[PDB]
Amino acid sequence: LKAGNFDVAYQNPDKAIKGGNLKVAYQSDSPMKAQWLSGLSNDATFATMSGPGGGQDGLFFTDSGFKFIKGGAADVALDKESKTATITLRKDLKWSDGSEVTAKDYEFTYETIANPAYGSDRWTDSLANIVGLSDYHTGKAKTISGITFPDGENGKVIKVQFKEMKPGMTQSGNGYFLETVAPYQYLKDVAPKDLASSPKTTTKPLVTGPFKPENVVAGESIKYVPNPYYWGEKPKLNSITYEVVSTAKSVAALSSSKYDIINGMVSSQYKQVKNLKGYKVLGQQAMYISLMYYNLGHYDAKNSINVQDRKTPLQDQNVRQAIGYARNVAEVDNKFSNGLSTPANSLIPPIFKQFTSSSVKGYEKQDLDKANKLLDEDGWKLNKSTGYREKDGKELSLVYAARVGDANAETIAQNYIQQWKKIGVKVSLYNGKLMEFNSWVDHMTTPPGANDWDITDGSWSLASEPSQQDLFSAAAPYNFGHFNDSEITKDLNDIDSAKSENPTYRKAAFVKYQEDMNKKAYVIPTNFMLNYTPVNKRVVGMTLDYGAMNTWSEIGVSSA
Amino acid sequence: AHAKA
Fold first, then answer.
1. Using a CB-CB distance cutoff of 8 angstroms, which residues of chain B are in contact with residue A462?
2. Which of A47, A65, A52 is nearest to A21 (CA)?
3. What are the Cα distances from residue A302, in Å, to A299, A305, A306, A448, A472?
4. Nearest Cα residue in chain B from A124
5. Which domain holds residue A468?
6. From chain B, which residues contact A within 8 Å (Cβ)?
7. What is the CATH number of the domain that holds A464?
8. Are A381 and A481 found together in one domain?
9. Do residues A547 and A63 touch, judged by C-beta distance below 8 A?
10. Do B1 and A441 touch (CB under 8 A)?
C-alpha cells in the first residue's frame, strides 16, 4: 500500500523479539484528559492515546474503508425487516479484571450518553431514531424499550430497534447506534453525576483491549501493560508508554530517540523530520477535504433553509466553473505542501473506495483555456485598457476571504489571485489581508450570512460515515455559500435512501452526487491530505492501514 | 458529524 509517495507500512526486514517496550507520543500543546468511557470523553488527544487499551472499548472491526466486518470484540448484523441491529459479543470478551463483558455493558453505554445525569455531551438527534430512547433521554421512560436481550442481560446478544433503517449503518462512526461497552458491574454504585470524575473512569478503569493502563499521569501519559484477559493473542511487547509531547519538543524528541513513534505531527514540521536517520516516515490519507466556496445567498434561520438569492456574477455556472479551472492547485501543492496536500478530484476522499472513483473528474488540472472560453461565451468580455472582463460596463471583480492557517497561506492565496488575473477576473483579499480563523468561522456561520465576500476556503475533518447532508444540504447552516439546487437535494437524499441500503446503489449515488457537485460548481474541491508518522527503524509490524485491526498485538521491536 | 478542520 502507498499513500502518495509514502509507504503506509514500515516493512521491517528484521524479526521482532519476544518482549520489549514501545514509546509512543502524541503531539499536542494541550494536556490529555483521561476518560475511559467513550460517552463521557470529549478529548480527541486522549481518544487516540486510548488505542492500546481498546480505544475506549470499541467493539467492531472494519475494513480499510470503515465498513463493519466480523471478527472483533463483537459482530453487528442488520436486519431490514426487523428494523434491528443485533450485536453479538464474543464468548471470550472479558474486562481487564477478568469479569465478563455482557449485554448489559453494551446497553449501559447508551445510559451514559442518554441519561443526562451522567453529563454527557454526546447525545445526538440520530439516537432519537432508536425506539424508546428519546423517551428515556427526556425521563418519560425508565428503560430503553428499543434495546432488548434475547439471552438476558448477562448473555452476549443485544438487539437495537430503530424507527427507520439508514444506509450508513454499515459504516463505523454512523452514530445511529453505538460501538462501545462500559463496565456496569464496576461502575453501578457510582452516582451518575459523579461518574466522569470517579477514579474508576479516569485513573483506574477496566478496559477490554490488548493492553490495560497500569498508570495514568493526569494530562500527560499512560503506561500500558498486557491485559491478561484479552480475547486475542498475547501481545509481543511487554509494555507501551504513550505520552503527550509539545509541538516545540517533537523534533528534538526524535533526534534524541525519546519516542519510537510520534503521532499527530503537523504538515509544517516535515523537512526537519524527513532527513532524520533512524526513522522511516509513513503516510496515510487523512479524513479530510478542503474546498472553495462561492457566496450565493443567505441562510433563513427561522425556517432553517438556505436561499440562493445573492446578486453576484457567481450565479452563472460558467463563471463558477471558470474560476475553478483557473486555479493551479497541483502546482501549488508541488511548490509548498512538502507532498502532504494532493489535488482533490471530488468532495469525498478515496479512503472511501466504496463511495468514490478516480473516474470522477474535477478541477485538479488547471485549464486556463477552458476558463477563458467559458467566460467569453457567457458575455464577460475582455477589456483592452484594463486586462479584466466586463458585462454591461461592470468589471468582473470578486472578494476572496482567504484565511490564516497553512504556513504559506498568503503565498497560496496570491498564487490564485494571479491565476484569476490571467482569465480577466480581478480578485482581492477580504480587507486586504488574510482572515483569522475565529473571525472566519464567525463570518461564515452567523446567520443570515454576509454579503461582502465572494470566494472563501473551508476544510473539514470527515466522519467515517461520510454523508454530507450536514455540509451541503438546503437546510445546513454549514452550507456557507447558501446554494439550493433541486438536483443536488435529490442526489443527497438518494445517498441516504432505502435503495442505498444496497452498497452498489449507494456507490452510484455517491458518484453521481460528486459529479453533479463538480458540474454545478457551487463549491470546488481543492485538496486531500496526507498524515505522516515517523517510526523508529527498530519497530516491527507498524502500519497506518485503516484496515489493520490488530496492530497493538502485532507490533514489536527488533531489538531492546 | 463533520467539523471545521
1. 1-2
2. A52
3. 9, 8, 11, 10, 18
4. B1
5. 286-526
6. 1-5
7. 3.10.105.10
8. yes
9. yes
10. no
